[PDB]
Amino acid sequence: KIPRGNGPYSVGCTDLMFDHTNKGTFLRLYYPSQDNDRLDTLWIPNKEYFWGLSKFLGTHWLMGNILRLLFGSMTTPANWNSPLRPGEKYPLVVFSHGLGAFRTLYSAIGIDLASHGFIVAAVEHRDRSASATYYFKDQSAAEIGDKSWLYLRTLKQEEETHIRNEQVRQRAKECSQALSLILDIDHGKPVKNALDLKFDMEQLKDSIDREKIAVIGHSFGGATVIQTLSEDQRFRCGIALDAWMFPLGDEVYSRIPQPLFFINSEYFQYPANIIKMKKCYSPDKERKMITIRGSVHQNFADFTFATGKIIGHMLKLKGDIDSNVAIDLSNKASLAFLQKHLGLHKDFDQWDCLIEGDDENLIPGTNINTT
Ligand SMILES: Cc1ccccc1-c1cc(C(=O)N2CC=CC2)ccc1C
Ligand SMILES: [Ca+2]
Ligand SMILES: [Cl-]
Numbered sequence: 001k002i003p004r005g006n007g008p009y010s011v012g013c014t015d016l017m018f019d020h021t022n023k024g025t026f027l028r029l030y031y032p033s034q035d036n037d038r039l040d041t042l043w044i045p046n047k048e049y050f051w052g053l054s055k056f057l058g059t060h061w062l063m064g065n066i067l068r069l070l071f072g073s074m075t076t077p078a079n080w081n082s083p084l085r086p087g088e089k090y091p092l093v094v095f096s097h098g099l100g101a102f103r104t105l106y107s108a109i110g111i112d113l114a115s116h117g118f119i120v121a122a123v124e125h126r127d128r129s130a131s132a133t134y135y136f137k138d139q140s141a142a143e144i145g146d147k148s149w150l151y152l153r154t155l156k157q158e159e160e161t162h163i164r165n166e167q168v169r170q171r172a173k174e175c176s177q178a179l180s181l182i183l184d185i186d187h188g189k190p191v192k193n194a195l196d197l198k199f200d201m202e203q204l205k206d207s208i209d210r211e212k213i214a215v216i217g218h219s220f221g222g223a224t225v226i227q228t229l230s231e232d233q234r235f236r237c238g239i240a241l242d243a244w245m246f247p248l249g250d251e252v253y254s255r256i257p258q259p260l261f262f263i264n265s266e267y268f269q270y271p272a273n274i275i276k277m278k279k280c281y282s283p284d285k286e287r288k289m290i291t292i293r294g295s296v297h298q299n300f301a302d303f304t305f306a307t308g309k310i311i312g313h314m315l316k317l318k319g320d321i322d323s324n325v326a327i328d329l330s331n332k333a334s335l336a337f338l339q340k341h342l343g344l345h346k347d348f349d350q351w352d353c354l355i356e357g358d359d360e361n362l363i364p365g366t367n368i369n370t371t
Pocket of ligand 1: 001053056057067071099100101147242298303306307316
């Protein structure tokens with residue numbers, strides 16, 4: 001089971017596509033909900049995601065159908081299409097996924113942020129870093145649910161530097177565009193969802209705390225945080241979860257005024273990556289780093305809960321640390337950080353020592369020795 005949120009609020013979930021094109025916004029939305037009696041949300045909702053996942057794991061079209069058999073009915077503990085909880089302005093997180101992932105695969109983070117009173121826009125990237133995504137060729141395809149599938153792009157060694165930077169840059173623009181879309185919805189603009197779903201987008205009118213916006217992401221999404229913050233001053237802080245810094249151009253590192261928090265795993269990180277994180281440090285800027293002890297790259301993704309301990313460890317989805325333990329540390333430190341830098345008036349400051357990695361499962365800064 002993906003763990004339920006630890007915060008006071010019930011959690012809802014819906015999908016938003018606007019516009020219907022490969023250049024429009026695709027996001028999954030987690031939000032505080034009025035009721036707690038809807039059906040749970042389908043974790044991986046289409047078979048083409050499983051196919052895109054098999055291709056990414058380097059297996060047959062056939063193995064994709066085996067993953068669909070084992071995982072195709074799995075839900076996440078979010079009320080599918082619940083009415084949004086009224087009477088409060090919610091701060092907003094935009095979430096960017098890792099390479100080979102897509103919008104649905106960080107529900108343990110998205111569900112927990114929402115239970116504490118956030119709206120979470122987990123975006124699906126059309127940069128061919130997702131395992132699979134979809135859009136509609138035109139208005140007619142949009143209406144009759146004729147989906148066009150975009151699958152993960154495999155690079156040559158040659159293409160790496162250039163293409164990953166193009167992608168981190170498209171990701172940033174997709175984060176900005178997702179933010180602009182939500183703000184318009186808030187500012188009352190009627191948007192016709194390209195997906196026919198029994199959730200009225202009008203509910204979101206006057207629901208956003210327009211000044212309290214952050215960008216969070218994992219892996220490629222960690223670099224998306226950094227690129228995003230450098231382009232969009234609307235994002236007031238960022239949290240890079242096990243950032244893979246390689247996509248970033250040399251120019252970004254000196255150009256991030258916003259508070260920025262690195263939550264790293266113990267076993268992913270490496271000198272070249274840490275050095276790139278250090279390139280972001282400055283005395284005039286807010287910068288914080290923790291390492292979760294006993295943890296691995298996928299400890300931030302839902303895959304960490306998808307299996308038992310032995311299969312999980314073998315496939316590098318679980319570490320020596322319990323997954324709920326590791327996600328609680330990441331989520332709770334995130335909560336305290338977001339409170340500090342968005343000016344929230346909640347109890348998240350109860351977790352301030354986590355920002356400094358004062359905990360037995362936390363390392364202050366990094367374990368990685370450099371120069
Ligand atoms: C556990 C799981 C459930 C359903 C679909 C895929 C997977 C899976 C996932 C990864 C993984 O670590 N990934 C990170 C990004 C994309 C896949 C590795 C192996 C498997 C079997
Ligand atoms: Ca901009
Ligand atoms: Cl790892």
